Amino acid sequence: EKREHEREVIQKAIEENNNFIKMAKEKLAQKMESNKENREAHLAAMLERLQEKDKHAEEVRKNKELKE
Amino acid sequence: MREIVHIQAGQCGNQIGAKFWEVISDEHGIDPTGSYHGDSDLQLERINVYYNEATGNKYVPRAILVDLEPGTMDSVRSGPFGQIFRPDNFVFGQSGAGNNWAKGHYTEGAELVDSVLDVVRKESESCDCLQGFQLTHSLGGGTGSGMGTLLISKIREEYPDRIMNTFSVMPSPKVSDTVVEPYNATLSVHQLVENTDETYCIDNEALYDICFRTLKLTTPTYGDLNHLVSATMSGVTTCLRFPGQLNADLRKLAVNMVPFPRLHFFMPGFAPLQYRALTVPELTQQMFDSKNMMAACDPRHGRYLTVAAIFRGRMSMKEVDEQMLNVQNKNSSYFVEWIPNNVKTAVCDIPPRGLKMSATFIGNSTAIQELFKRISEQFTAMFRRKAFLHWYTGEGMDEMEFTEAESNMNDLVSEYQQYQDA
């Protein structure tokens, strides 16, 4: 009974070192994923705003042409 | 040929084990080379209890040296009698045990135990009639304590009908390495209650006090403490190492000193701690004074269940009995009456180096409960706030094993109290 308790203790220590490593690895991957997403969405929205301003500058040149 | 296999583990275990071998090797006339140059055969008649013979007829300790890091054993090796030991008999890891019982018992120590059992098996198998085993260790660290107890379990499994004996150094705040010492000792005592037949409780509190309030050493080193331990260990093993009117062996000792299987924790005593030899009456008074005890319990707080005492040197056997009998019949409040003739006395002619008279005492007293209380109180002061426990849960232990170890120590205390009052 005692040997089997010995086995249990040490397998538990391995299991815990492992679950800790695993958890860390996952936590990192989720945060880096969410990070890239968010950053990209900010740049995309910026570029979208700029591009609307380009389109608007067509409708201002195209519209000066329509006074003739 | 009633051989004993000696094992020493951890820093404390190897430091005092080494001194031990220094002392007895000198008493048996062996030099640092394993070569005999003594003048009697009283030195050689039972030399085989502790020493194996060599090819050139040299003597080599039946000793196994164990540690989870190499430092101390490098020191042992480079010390005075370092080369006497069988080099195959040094068994060690590299990583240490961090004053952590769990690492010695369950993780780091588990990885080394089998190689130790291999050297053990190699030493047992060439024994004409092996008596049992003797382990030197402390209970407050990680290796001697965790791994030492693990070892005792394995040895009991492989040699269930041999005697297991320990010299166990108990921690004290006075002379302390780390705060987790009570945890490690409470876990270790629990093993010792189930798996030893005889344990000599060597309290570091007492050794400090004898060193400070008596030897007048103002800053006592571990060498000072180990010098007392060395003397006590030599005295306590005199009757095994030497021929007398008694044939002493470990099993007979256990039978005559242990009336209840769990109460096998002994308080040792020594006298003296000098050109004037002591007289028999002084030996007798000193030995039984609390100040000559090495466990830091006062024997007047409890009762003696049993006592074994030797006197070393050439003296008056008649005066011994007179004095022995006298100190009983002056202090009958402190011996049990329901165990007739519970104090036994012997004499060896060979004294130890540097004394012409000495006396050593082995007492099974209920006053030893004081020691276990001291540890329990300290354990509980931390455990009630689960302080410091992460060091052990991180090696796989649960609080449960703690709660149980606590419980079994308090039961031990209750048991000693029950017999102090019978």
Ligand SMILES: Nc1nc2c(ncn2[C@@H]2O[C@H](COP(=O)(O)OP(=O)(O)O)[C@@H](O)[C@H]2O)c(=O)[nH]1
């Ligand atoms: N009397 C004595 N006690 C010691 C000695 N070395 C360490 N200790 C005590 O032993 C405990 C620490 O255990 P230690 O042997 O150093 O750890 P280990 O290597 O893990 O077995 C503490 O209670 C120290 O006070 C020694 O040489 N003599």
Ligand SMILES: COc1ccc([C@H]2[C@@H](C)C(=O)N2c2cc(OC)c(OC)c(OC)c2)cc1O
């Ligand atoms: C009653 O108590 C006794 C206690 C000890 C002994 C003997 C025998 C069991 C033996 O071995 N004893 C022993 C061993 C001793 O060391 C191994 C010893 O002192 C060192 C000692 O001092 C009287 C006695 C005989 C007894 O009757």
Ligand SMILES: [Ca+2]
């Ligand atoms: Ca390892």
Ligand SMILES: [Mg+2]
């Ligand atoms: Mg240490």
